[PDB]
Design a binder for this molecule. Sequence first.
Ligand SMILES: [Mg+2]
Ligand SMILES: [Mg+2]
Ligand SMILES: [Mg+2]
Ligand SMILES: [Mg+2]
Ligand SMILES: [Mg+2]
Ligand SMILES: [Mg+2]
Ligand SMILES: [Mg+2]
Ligand SMILES: [Mg+2]
Ligand SMILES: [Mg+2]
Ligand SMILES: [Mg+2]
Ligand SMILES: [Mg+2]
Ligand SMILES: [Mg+2]
Ligand SMILES: [Mg+2]
Lengths: 117, 59, 101, 150, 137, 112
Amino acid sequence: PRAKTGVVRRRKHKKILKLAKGYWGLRSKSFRKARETLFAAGNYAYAHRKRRKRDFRRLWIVRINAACRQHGLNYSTFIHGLKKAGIEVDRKNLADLAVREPQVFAELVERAKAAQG
Amino acid sequence: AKHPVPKKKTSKARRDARRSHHALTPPTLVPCPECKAMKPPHTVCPECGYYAGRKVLEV
Amino acid sequence: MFAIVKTGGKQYRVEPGLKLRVEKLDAEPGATVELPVLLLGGEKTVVGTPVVEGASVVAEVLGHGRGKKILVSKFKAKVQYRRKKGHRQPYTELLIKEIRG
Amino acid sequence: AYSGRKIWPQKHTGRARHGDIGAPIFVGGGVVFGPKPRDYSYTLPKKVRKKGLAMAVADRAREGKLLLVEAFAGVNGKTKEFLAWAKEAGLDGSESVLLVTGNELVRRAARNLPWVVTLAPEGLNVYDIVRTERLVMDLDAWEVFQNRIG
Amino acid sequence: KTYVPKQVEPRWVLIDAEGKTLGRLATKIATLLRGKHRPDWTPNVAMGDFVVVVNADKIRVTGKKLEQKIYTRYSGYPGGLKKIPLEKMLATHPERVLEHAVKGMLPKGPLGRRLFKRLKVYAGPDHPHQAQRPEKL
Amino acid sequence: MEAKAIARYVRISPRKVRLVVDLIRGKSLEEARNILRYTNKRGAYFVAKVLESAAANAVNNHDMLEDRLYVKAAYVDEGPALKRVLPRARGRADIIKKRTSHITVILGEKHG
RNA sequence: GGCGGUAGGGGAGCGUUCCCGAUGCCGAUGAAGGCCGACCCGCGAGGGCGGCUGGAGGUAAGGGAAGUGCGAAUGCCGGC
RNA sequence: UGAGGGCGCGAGCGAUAACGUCCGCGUCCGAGCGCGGGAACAACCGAGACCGCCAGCUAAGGCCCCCAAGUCUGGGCUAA
RNA sequence: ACCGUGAGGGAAAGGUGAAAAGAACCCCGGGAGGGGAGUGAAAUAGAGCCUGAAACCGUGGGCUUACAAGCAGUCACGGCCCCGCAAGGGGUUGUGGCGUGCCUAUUGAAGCAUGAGCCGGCGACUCACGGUCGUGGGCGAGCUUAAGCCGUUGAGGCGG
Ligand SMILES: [Mg+2]
Ligand SMILES: [Mg+2]
Ligand SMILES: [Mg+2]
Ligand SMILES: [Mg+2]
Ligand SMILES: [Mg+2]
Ligand SMILES: [Mg+2]
Ligand SMILES: [Mg+2]
Ligand SMILES: [Mg+2]
Ligand SMILES: [Mg+2]
Ligand SMILES: [Mg+2]
Ligand SMILES: [Mg+2]
Ligand SMILES: [Mg+2]
Ligand SMILES: [Mg+2]
């Protein structure tokens, strides 16, 4: 009962090609090259799916910081009042109401200058 | 087996970008004073002759 | 009219009249659920307390399932540790009705 | 059949290191751990087949799929001199049947029967018993099957 | 999802630098380029504003840097490390006394030498009256 | 309708004729000929016995007129190759690839 | 409540070749194999589905036997 | 598995040198070259990664710009 | 065949079609090779003629590139072309975030430590006997056969 290779070894190399689509030169047609750059991706995609928030976590703040300093106060001084107001609402994204109607946020600012000064 | 040596198999673009300077200039030509033929500058066409220097062929 | 809402560990900015994906909840896929957890108002209604005072937003479900299976292959270099794994992330094809209270 | 001679020295060669061409790493040379011929038999205790002989017989009795016989319109040699016997007994080609008898005539009368396999009174192979969906046997059997156990 | 605009109209700015401390001035300028003074800040599309800083030969800096700080330029040849002081430039090229400071605060990618384009620092003053001249102080 | 003709199996390396074919491409046949008949190469001859033979069967088999057609598309691929050895030095034997070709020329219709 | 993980240990599975299952069944209204796909099942190795090509074998559910799963060995053959 | 290595410490050797070595305790890399600060930097600092989410609290470390966060308040200090 | 004086070493290479019915004839052309017509169920079965992958070469088309610093990818957004029904999806990438290839040995890597040009196939814990543990089944003061002998020929029974 002999069982040569046959189908098995090829179909797999076709799947790696299937995920190596648009990879420069040999990196998408040479098999044991495509095997490699897939290793980094699934790692590169892992870490960055952990990172994509911290990216936006940072971006939101600057926009927020851009807003508060347009009333005349810093981001550090902005947040505290909100926290002093105990408002677990402000998903740092949802503070994007600087081009999503501003008085909705412009009057979040004055509810900060209260409980501190 | 000798001296300097390529290190890495030269890639495709690599190989190909060198080869832009290799495409052929198509031949420039004029038409014969008499013949309705196409012919180089400063030449004598392989059918006609001239008017101060023969070439006249045969049937 | 600004309709904020906070469900499944994340909040969102809703204007009333289109669909949304949110995580599941112990519900039958053909009904309508209430989120008395609400924030704000498009005519300016700040909330000194976190959660509003009793207001709400009404949303209609649709079904369940998954969007994309996203492969999660973990490979540690050097040390023969490759893993091949993926999953589906279910959700609720959620349709929001009103902001009534 | 290849010889036993190094292919090219390993020292100062450029290529790898190698030897005789029976080496499985090559091609066409030798097999690795190929399947040389060998027996598969053993010695299963008789008390497993003895009891194993009984178990299967009742299995057809437990389902009724049994019949001892003694009377035959086909005590001679003709496949036609049997299928009518089956007609007058109850075998309408619906389901398979194993047959036992000590008469080498009835076997002929069904040795060409696709749904009826011959069987001598002795080698009641539990394979063919469980193979066929119904069983038939005779007293000429039910004295040795009895002398086995009974 | 997140807010991103589509079209963006920029705005220009007028700034002087008489008595303005050198570095602290040019610091806000970079922020004023990288429009993080714009809640519609965009981390790639280059929304940077256009700062037109008239006058600079009258720029002063803390300490004795006028006779102490030197800038470096490297040709490639030996003996190429050209060490130019903050004084000799404040005499025939007082225009790049700020430039080779903001580029020191602009980011590193290709967007930098786009942001730095959206800014010119003459020393006159009274620059080419293009149009609007938003003098922010 | 396009008309085609391949000169299978032509002992000339591809890298050579591709330089030539890539000159009559898009040119009208009249110029294509005058281009070829004065193109100091070697592939120019092989095209001629496959061009005017591809413009031929655009007439003797595909009822078109030569007075109109144009170089629609023209390409060449790579056939096999005879293998010959090259006694290099000190006993080395480095083979050599004498390459053939597969010159392919198709022609269309100007107007009408 | 725990679930990073090398040598190593245990458990679970997918695939290939062949046999019982078969004088069975699927197959000319197109099998095995090869090109695709953004469809579906599975976390998986994999299994189904639509299209193209090919042209004659292929074999379920439960058991059994293996020459059984490749990315490297300056591995071997061939081609490039 | 029985070649280990780093750092803090207590010794010996060494020149109260060695990113040198031999020991003891402990820690960590090896097996955590997976994350954050240390510009970079296996073992220095924080912190054990089952997967997903454009959610919130934090440690180290940081808050003028690249670079997210006070050119924060009060009090002194230094002109290199 | 080929190598070696010599003993001796010692390969590669099967596949049209059921039937040659294998292209008469015409045309380009020196021929080779092709176009057409025709046989054939099929010439996309054309005489290295079943299937035809992969490396490798080229033509056509969609996206991009001549202010840019790069294990060549990942994440985000926009942009171009295409599919599609809301919405969504495919292919490309301009900008921004991060990003020190694989295996093996090494305490130790990104490495100036081994190895691989690439692709496709062959290729690496099986077997026999005895024995320890585990487990599944048979009998249970018992348990069990070996050579061999009767018989269909992929049947077993005796044999202590
Ligand atoms: Mg945060
Ligand atoms: Mg705002
Ligand atoms: Mg709610
Ligand atoms: Mg998933
Ligand atoms: Mg042999
Ligand atoms: Mg040797
Ligand atoms: Mg088979
Ligand atoms: Mg760091
Ligand atoms: Mg945990
Ligand atoms: Mg900042
Ligand atoms: Mg051989
Ligand atoms: Mg919608
Ligand atoms: Mg291979």
